[PDB]
Ligand binder design. Structure first.
Ligand SMILES: Nc1ncnc2c1ncn2[C@@H]1O[C@H](COP(=O)(O)OP(=O)(O)OP(=O)(O)O)[C@@H](O)[C@H]1O
Ligand SMILES: Nc1ncnc2c1ncn2[C@@H]1O[C@H](COP(=O)(O)OP(=O)(O)OP(=O)(O)O)[C@@H](O)[C@H]1O
Ligand SMILES: Nc1ncnc2c1ncn2[C@@H]1O[C@H](COP(=O)(O)OP(=O)(O)O)[C@@H](O)[C@H]1O
Lengths: 585, 627, 223
DNA sequence: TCGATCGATCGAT
DNA sequence: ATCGATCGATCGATTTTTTTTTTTTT
């Protein structure tokens, strides 16, 4: 027990416990009476300033033991309120939760030391886990007194700290079971970089965590955090200085469950579902800044549908498509990176890690042997885009064949046989070998790659640009329209019924349902596939009818499934058939 | 918190006052039966179940589950000095102790281990997962399921090492339980005390102990991994009398106690108080693909006879393989020939391989990857890889440090382990260029020659091969021929027994057939309705194994005509000048299929109509472009 | 203490420093003892402002002067004759237009880009060297990339990103011989100069950074 | 945990 | 009573490696 003000500080955090606001709400039915047992209470600094400013901004200036005093006061309180759950005799760290100073990883700059502050950056390096060494209820049969000894280190509190031949030489059976342990973790953050000056390199940070907070996202998302600063080691007293962060609660800033989702928003969705001609709207929703597809790109944004059998096998449910000369195909994929979740562009020139790892490690603090990640499992249960496809090498393509079609990734990097679950889709971009060409010579052989992929993909297709002398003034009219609010109220609309946010919020239920097939798809699909393989190869189109297989069925069923999710009609109809199939023809 | 005295009496009372009468004829002592079984020197480890301790008491029915390390040692010294019932010179350790006292610092009873105890929870409590062992599983005997990986072999661990000065004849007791230690100085005795009469004591394993000490690696199920995560692992130290209780590829269920670990060493990287833990266990009940769920640890005749005479057909076993589509009937039965085989002998010293290896050619939509992915599941000890899914060392052996010894041994790839079965490969052409020699080598069976160290790289692979690849741009162009449309090594194409190409031209009424075939795979989860009773996979597993053990003779009465069959074979393909190749190994092949086909007869009655199917089988295996 | 983010790389410096060691073969280094900068015309005038109201005054008084553009079409060459319509938009290329992002995706192309090809003997090289000379820019020509820099510091064995269209993110770039450099390194630059989202996907990183650069192209046609 | 450092101590002289 | 040799308590000093991604030339 150091300086006597520490205990004034204990009672001053007790001085939060006056009346209904905290003596009523914040303590009691809060974790253990409600029996969630997530030890960390929820603090908000603003109320602290509104009660005790010297104890509010004493915290965001120093945190020597104010956390520990918060915890001491909490156990003193709950021991009175409900001692039954007072059996977790540890520190019980708490929130400090809640724009005073929110500088970047680039600007955690030689100050804020001894402060508790805010950071933003990239979810990255979702990394390895270990447990922690606390205190152990030793024992000696010769004397039969179960003594104790607590162990510390700097990353938990200030001070720094197994017994053998303790008293004079008597027995020591180190009793585990009543010896306790936290959970421990280490990972990092990177600046969300597009605030960068690209004359400079976006900088980095270092963060450490603790028990009931562990490993709460995947590397490749965006996040907020609010934590404190510590710096232990030698610094020419022996060699310079380093950083680390703690004292925080987690904040991911890309979810929907973050939204207060009551039974009313679903009610608006299901009310408006009855409106039939909404598909043509949602097609004209996605790309309000560009003619031109997206009726189906939507279905690609709906993942797919998974179908298994008893103790047999399983299938992949999702769709993959693409078709075009230069000049709005290399600007229609950024409707995915920043429209919808888990979207990762790739290069068109990048090797050795689309799904590879290289597994390289170099004498880790612990025994990290061999592993790195890839660029598909990041996109599990969603989507991928690429630009400049055809110029990709012919190396990693076959990995795409495998992991697309088989719907599982069961690979090895020469050290370890590996298996996982990556069940995603992908796009890319397109370029013919000879520039401005798809029509006079042939439709095919203007693309130049294996005819195996169109089975792996779905579509042999076409995309071009010009017009003759009559409609050229009509494209002039549309181009000048592209080059306000008038007459997009002739487009009977609202910026809340057609938007980005509500459009995103129609994810949850369309992906939670399982709109089973009835029966009346069957004769239609069969007769149509018959006509398809029969007479698609005549009248100027014989050579553009090669890639048909018995794979248009799984695509058709993917399509009617997806279209059955955009209005949640727990059934499937002929109108869904038309709206799903007219693309193929 | 609790006491070591009345608790001791309670557990002794449990040891004695125990005639748990679960049913009729149970009026004696179960643990007293186990006691006299110790008295037999037959049993050396009792297994314990909560039901006994469920009915006796409640503390130690919940007090031992969290500690597991004290009440067991009390159980140890409790029973160690309980002699209710020789011979002396029967056990190597005990006979060495009786050597050493017949020859004659107190000896522990820990030295005379001579018997052990484990546990067996009640209701494999639940399938707790290697991920979810969070910050409350220290010391607690938890039940969990994992997946095996990279097993090594039995090693003897040490517990007590004794020296002897050779000047005072001292028999010291230096017990050890951790990994590392140091012995004692020259004379830690009283006759060899500070008095100058001291020499230097020296170890003797004779009056010392060793213990079974196995180690394996433990990998995850890859069914409950998080959505955006990667498979993890954990380590095993399975002690006691359970070494050799797992194999690579057993979905095991292990029950033991989590514990921490102190990798003593450098005080900076280590000594950081970070707890690089490890596992401990006693009981390995592998619930998937082990001695429990697989019987015969298939030859058991009586239990299957009721179904054996219950049915009599072959095609019933035919289309029961991947029964979710229709079509390609003649492929599945011959594939089923691949699972059985069974033609083994040592005629003239030369051994004949009986593993069929066939490929799949032509893929404008055929479900090529379906048969492979299915049969690799149903076929016990199967694998699956693709063209650029693995390098040459991924297929062949490799090297890695060894936690058991560190010997830097060789570990093999997919084909290295799939012997005595079938290793499946898909999309063969784009596998690799040098890989074709790698598959050229298996045609001289049990011969995997590598140049990794390039010394010998000898290895006995007795695998089949399930090949499958695609044609290049096009599918038998009107002018193209074999080795023209395909760009595979024709020598490699030579070394197969059945070539298999799957080409589907438009059939105006077969498409609707399959459309109604596969669409019913999705409204429900079972294709064949009310037309035949397709068999369960599990009964399939034994029904295939029983056929193998026959090994019939050959009918000389048809040997006179098998050669004539080869005559018409080699002639009706020879009637044209430039048809595809017809090989002289056909007579060595036709003999190898009719045998395995008779294996499912289990009769040694290969008949004239027996090969009558094989003749049309190879007959259609070629000439697949006539119409 | 206060002079990080005082110098971006790619600049001309004056320096006041000191040459002192850290540990007879022992090591060198130097620090700042009160840095300042250069005046190669405006040697360091690249991010900050010690320009004064006098400078703004002179500037904007030049601006309204409606005989400045035809004045500036004769600015680059105090030694070359003619070629004025070629020159009326080698100077606008510096100035750039507008990088207008919108509520949808369309971050439309900000800068502009240049072409020229012609028989030798018309002073191509000096002109492009002059456009390099006169805010920030760099110059190569052919033989250089399609790959970016995923190397590894032999210290710690990781895959860092050293990153040089990066170095024109407000500057520009000029090259000659798009012709005589073959196609293995033209595709990354196919991409960069239409979206500026320079992507990376090699190993376990997908940090599609970006850089806003323009570009100038000389050429040589056969015969 | 290993090595020389240094200071003390026990018979000789 | 002076001095050298041996014993022994006291002090401080050591413990980072196997794949990959560009690059020049056959
Ligand atoms: N209908 C349209 N919708 C959206 N943008 C358009 C449209 N028409 C023209 N544009 C604009 O014109 C430019 C077209 O270039 P774009 O990015 O499509 O090339 P690209 O298709 O990527 O080239 P490549 O396919 O060869 O890589 C873009 O900046 C785009 O914003
Ligand atoms: N129009 C001109 N007026 C004055 N001097 C000129 C003119 N054209 C060229 N010169 C002189 O010739 C030189 C310019 O030649 P330059 O290097 O441009 O040829 P180039 O364009 O590089 O030829 P190539 O394109 O074949 O390499 C200058 O040094 C200049 O002194
Ligand atoms: N008649 C059919 N019955 C069942 N499935 C079929 C049928 N026709 C096609 N399919 C589908 O076609 C797919 C073919 O994939 P596959 O040919 O194995 O790929 P690859 O050509 O790369 O081997 C199968 O996964 C299956 O789902």
């Amino acid at each position: 027990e150091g300086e006597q003000f520490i205990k004034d500080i204990q009672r001053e955090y007790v001085d939060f416990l006056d009346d209904e606001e905290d003596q009523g709400i914040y303590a009691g039915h809060v974790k253990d009476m409600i029996a969630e047992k997530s030890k960390r209470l929820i603090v908000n600094v603003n109320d602290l300033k509104r009660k005790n400013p010297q104890r509010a901004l004493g915290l965001l200036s120093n945190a020597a033991d104010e956390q520990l005093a918060f915890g001491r006061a909490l156990k003193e309180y709950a021991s009175t309120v409900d001692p039954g759950y007072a059996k977790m005799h540890e520190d019980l760290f708490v929130g400090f939760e809640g724009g005073n100073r929110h500088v970047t990883p680039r600007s955690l700059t030689s100050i804020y030391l001894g402060n508790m502050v805010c950071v933003e950056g990239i979810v990255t390096k979702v990394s390895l886990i270990r447990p922690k060494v606390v205190r152990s209820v030793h024992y000696c049969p010769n004397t039969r007194k179960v003594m104790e000894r607590k162990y510390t280190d700097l990353t938990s509190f200030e001070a720094v700290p197994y017994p053998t031949k303790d008293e004079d030489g008597n027995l020591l059976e180190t009793e585990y079971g009543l010896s306790v342990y936290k959970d421990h973790q280490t990972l990092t953050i990177q600046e969300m970089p597009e605030k960068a000056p690209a004359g400079q390199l976006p900088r980095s940070v270092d963060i450490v965590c603790d028990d009931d907070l562990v490993d709460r996202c995947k590397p490749g998302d965006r996040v907020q955090i609010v934590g404190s600063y510590r710096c232990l080691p030698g610094k020419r007293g022996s060699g310079t200085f380093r950083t680390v962060l703690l004292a925080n609660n987690i904040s991911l800033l890309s979810k929907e469950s973050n939204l207060d989702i009551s039974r009313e928003d679903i009610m608006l969705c299901k009310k408006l579902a009855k409106n039939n001609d909404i598909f043509e709207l949602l097609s004209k929703s996605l790309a309000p800044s560009i003619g031109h597809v997206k009726q189906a790109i939507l279905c690609l944004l709906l993942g797919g549908v998974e179908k298994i059998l008893p103790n047999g096998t399983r299938l992949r449910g999702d769709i993959n498509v693409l078709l075009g000369d230069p000049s709005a195909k290399s600007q229609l994929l950024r409707y995915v990176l920043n429209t919808a979740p888990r979207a990762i562009p790739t290069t068109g020139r990048g090797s050795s890690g689309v799904g590879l790892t290289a597994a390289v490690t170099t004498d880790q603090e612990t025994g990290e042997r061999r592993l790195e990640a890839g660029a598909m499992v990041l996109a599990d249960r969603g989507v991928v885009c690429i630009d400049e496809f055809d110029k990709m090498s012919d190396i990693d393509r076959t990995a795409i064949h495998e992991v697309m079609e088989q719907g599982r990734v069961t690979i090895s990097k020469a050290g370890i046989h590996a298996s996982l679950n990556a069940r995603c889709s992908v796009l890319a971009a397109a370029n013919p070998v000879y520039g401005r060409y798809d029509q006079y010579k042939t439709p095919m052989e203007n693309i130049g790659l294996q005819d195996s992929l169109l089975s792996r993909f779905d579509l042999l297709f076409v995309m071009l640009d010009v017009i003759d002398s009559d409609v050229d003034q009509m494209i002039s009219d549309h181009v000048v329209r592209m080059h306000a609010l008038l007459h997009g109220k002739s487009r009977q609309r609202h910026e809340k019924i057609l938007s980005v946010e509500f459009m995103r919020k129609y994810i949850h239920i369309a992906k939670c349902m399982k709109p089973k097939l009835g029966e009346q798809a069957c004769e239609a699909i069969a007769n149509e596939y018959s006509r398809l393989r029969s007479q698609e190869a005549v009248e100027t189109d014989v050579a553009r009818t090669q890639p048909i297989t018995a794979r248009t069925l799984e695509t058709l069923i993917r399509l009617s499934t997806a279209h059955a999710r955009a209005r949640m009609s727990k059934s499937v109809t002929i109108d869904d058939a038309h709206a799903a199939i007219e693309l193929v023809q | 918190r609790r006491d070591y005295a009345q608790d001791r009496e309670s557990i002794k009372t449990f040891l004695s006052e125990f005639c748990k009468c679960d049913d009729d004829g149970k009026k004696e002592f179960v643990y007293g039966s186990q006691l006299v079984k110790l008295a037999h020197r037959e049993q050396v480890l009792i297994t314990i179940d909560l039901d006994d301790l469920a009915e006796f008491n409640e503390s130690l029915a919940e007090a031992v589950v969290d500690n597991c390390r004290r009440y067991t040692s009390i159980f140890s010294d409790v029973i160690a000095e309980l002699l209710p019932s020789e011979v002396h010179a029967k056990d190597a350790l005990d006979v060495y102790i009786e050597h050493r006292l017949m020859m004659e610092n107190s000896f522990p009873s820990e030295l005379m281990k001579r018997f052990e105890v484990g546990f067996k929870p009640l209701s494999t409590e639940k399938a707790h997962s290697i991920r979810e062992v969070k910050a409350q599983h220290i010391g607690k005997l938890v039940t969990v399921r994992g997946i095996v990986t990279r097993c090594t072999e039995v090693k003897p661990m040490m517990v007590v090492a004794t020296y002897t000065c050779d000047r005072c004849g001292s028999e010291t007791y230096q017990p050890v339980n951790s990994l590392s230690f140091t012995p004692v100085h020259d004379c830690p005795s009283d006759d060899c005390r500070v008095n100058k009469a001291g020499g230097r004591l020296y170890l003797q394993t004779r009056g010392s102990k060793f213990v079974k000490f196995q180690e394996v690696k433990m990998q995850e199920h890859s069914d409950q991994v998080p959505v955006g995560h990667i498979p993890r692992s954990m380590t095993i130290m399975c002690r006691g009398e359970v070494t050799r209780m797992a194999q690579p590829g057993d979905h095991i269920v292990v029950s033991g106690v989590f514990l921490p670990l102190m990798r003593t060493g450098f005080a900076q990287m280590i000594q950081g108080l970070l707890s690089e833990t490890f596992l401990q266990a006693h009981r390995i009940i592998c619930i998937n693909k082990n001695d429990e769920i697989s019987d015969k640890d298939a030859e058991l005749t009586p239990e299957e006879l009721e179904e054996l005479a219950q049915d009599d057909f072959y095609e019933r076993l035919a289309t029961s393989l991947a029964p979710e589509i229709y079509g390609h009937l003649d492929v599945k039965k011959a594939l089923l020939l691949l699972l059985v085989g069974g033609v083994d002998k040592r005629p003239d010293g030369m051994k004949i391989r009986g593993n069929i290896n066939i490929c799949l050619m032509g893929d404008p939509g055929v479900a090529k990857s379906q048969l492979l992915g299915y049969i690799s599941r149903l076929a016990v000890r199967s694998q699956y890889t693709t063209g650029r899914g693995s390098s040459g060392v991924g297929l062949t052996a490799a090297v890695m440090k060894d936690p058991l010894t560190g010997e830097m041994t060789l570990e093999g790839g997919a084909l290295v382990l799939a012997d005595q079965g079938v290793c499946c490969i898909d999309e063969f052409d784009k596998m690799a260029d040098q890989d074709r020699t790698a598959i050229h080598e298996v045609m001289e069976q049990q011969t995997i020659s590598i140049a990794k160290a390039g010394i010998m790289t000898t290895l006995n692979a007795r695998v089949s091969i399930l090949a499958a690849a695609n044609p290049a741009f096009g599918r038998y162009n009107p002018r193209r021929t074999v080795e023209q449309n395909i760009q595979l090594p024709a020598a490699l194409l030579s070394r197969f027994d059945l070539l298999w190409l799957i080409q589907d031209k438009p059939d105006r009424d077969n498409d609707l057939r399959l459309a109604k075939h596969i669409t019913y795979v999705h409204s429900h989860s079972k294709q064949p309705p009310t037309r035949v009773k397709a068999l369960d996979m599990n009964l399939m597993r034994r029904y295939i194994n029983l056929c193998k053990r026959k090994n019939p003779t050959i009918p000389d009465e048809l040997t006179d005509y098998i050669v004539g069959a080869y005559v018409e074979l080699r002639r009706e393909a020879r009637n044209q000048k430039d048809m595809t190749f017809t090989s002289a190994r056909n007579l060595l092949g036709i003999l190898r299929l009719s045998t395995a086909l008779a294996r499912l007869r289990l009769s040694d009655s290969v008949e004239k109509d027996d090969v009558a199917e094989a003749l049309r089988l190879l007959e259609m295996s070629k000439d697949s472009l006539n119409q | 203490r206060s002079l990080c983010e005082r110098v971006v790389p790619g600049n001309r410096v004056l320096i006041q420093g000191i040459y002192s060691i850290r540990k007879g073969v022992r090591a060198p280094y130097m620090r700042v003892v009160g840095i300042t900068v250069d005046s190669e015309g405006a040697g360091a005038i690249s991010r900050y402002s010690n320009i004064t109201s006098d400078e703004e005054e002179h500037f904007r008084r030049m601006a309204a002067s409606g005989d400045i553009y035809e004045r500036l079409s004769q600015s680059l060459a105090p030694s070359i004759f003619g070629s004025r319509d070629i020159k009326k938009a080698i100077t606008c290329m510096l100035f750039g237009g507008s990088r207008k992002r919108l509520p949808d995706g369309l971050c439309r192309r900000g800068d502009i880009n240049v072409l020229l090809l012609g028989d030798p003997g018309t002073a191509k090289s000096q002109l492009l060297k002059f456009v390099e000379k006169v805010p920030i820019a760099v110059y190569t020509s052919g033989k250089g990339g399609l790959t970016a820099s995923v190397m590894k510091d032999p210290q710690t064995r990781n895959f860092v990103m050293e990153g040089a269209m990066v170095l024109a993110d407000g500057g520009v770039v000029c090259i000659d011989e798009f012709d005589k450099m073959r196609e293995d390194d033209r595709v990354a630059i196919h991409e960069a100069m239409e979206q500026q989202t320079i992507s990376i996907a090699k190993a376990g990183i997908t940090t599609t950074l970006n850089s806003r650069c323009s570009v100038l192209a000389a050429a040589n046609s056969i015969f």
